[PDB]
Enzyme design. Sequence first.
Site, short mmCIF file in Angstrom:
data_model
loop_
_atom_site.label_atom_id
_atom_site.label_comp_id
_atom_site.label_asym_id
_atom_site.label_seq_id
_atom_site.Cartn_x
_atom_site.Cartn_y
_atom_site.Cartn_z
N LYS A 64 -11.29 -8.64 3.26
CA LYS A 64 -10.57 -7.45 2.77
C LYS A 64 -10.58 -7.37 1.24
CE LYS A 64 -7.70 -6.79 6.86
NZ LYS A 64 -6.30 -6.54 7.34
N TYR A 86 -9.46 1.84 12.44
CA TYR A 86 -8.12 1.45 12.88
C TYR A 86 -7.45 2.43 13.86
CZ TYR A 86 -7.92 -2.37 9.52
OH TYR A 86 -8.13 -3.56 8.87
N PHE A 106 2.73 0.93 10.74
CA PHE A 106 1.94 0.20 9.74
C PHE A 106 0.53 0.77 9.51
N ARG A 156 -10.54 -16.27 14.87
CA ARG A 156 -9.08 -16.11 14.88
C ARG A 156 -8.33 -17.38 14.51
NH1 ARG A 156 -7.27 -11.57 17.00
NH2 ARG A 156 -5.52 -12.30 18.34
N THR A 181 -1.32 -13.21 11.59
CA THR A 181 -1.38 -11.98 10.81
C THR A 181 -0.40 -11.98 9.62
OG1 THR A 181 -1.27 -11.12 13.09
CG2 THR A 181 -2.27 -9.69 11.43
N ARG A 204 -5.67 -17.22 5.97
CA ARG A 204 -4.57 -16.39 5.54
C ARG A 204 -3.50 -17.19 4.81
NH1 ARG A 204 -4.81 -12.63 10.87
NH2 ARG A 204 -6.13 -10.94 10.05
N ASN A 228 -3.80 -9.32 3.60
CA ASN A 228 -3.96 -10.52 4.40
C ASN A 228 -5.38 -11.08 4.50
OD1 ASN A 228 -4.96 -8.71 6.37
ND2 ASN A 228 -3.75 -9.64 8.03
N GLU A 267 -16.67 -2.81 17.16
CA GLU A 267 -16.61 -2.98 15.70
C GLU A 267 -17.98 -3.35 15.14
OE1 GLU A 267 -13.40 -5.77 14.95
OE2 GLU A 267 -11.86 -4.44 15.84
#
Length: 140
Positions: free
Chosen positions: A10, A50, A58, A86, A92, A103, A113, A127
């Site tokens: 991100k 998303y 959110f 993951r 998260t 994270r 995050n 995706e």
Amino acid sequence: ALERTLSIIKPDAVAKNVIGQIYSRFENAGLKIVAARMAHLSRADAEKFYAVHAERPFFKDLVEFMISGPVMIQVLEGEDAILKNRDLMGATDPKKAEKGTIRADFADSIDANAVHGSDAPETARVEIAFFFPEMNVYSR
Ligand SMILES: [Cl-]
């Protein structure tokens, strides 16, 4: 039995220049980068990406934190790629994220995050196709 998952570093983690460290966590966990590009998503792209969270509280924040700067997008391949990714990413919420995860180490908050990973096989397929034509995904 080598599946594939979509990963995004991100804009907060790109801005910290830790693409390499994150990549090394994928590679040291036995995942292989089989597709990659650096992109700056438009608001529209972030929204389609998303969509499943559209009517959610959110949503606004999640789109805007995804489009604030360039991101690093990759397809990771390996045994249990989806779950391994993951595990490496962690919870998260960084606050509730285990020591040693991406994270816990690089995420500034719930919104900033650090990473995304696909959450199941069907979301991973959709995706990957959203970001890459198969012609540019190199199984090896
Ligand atoms: Cl905009």
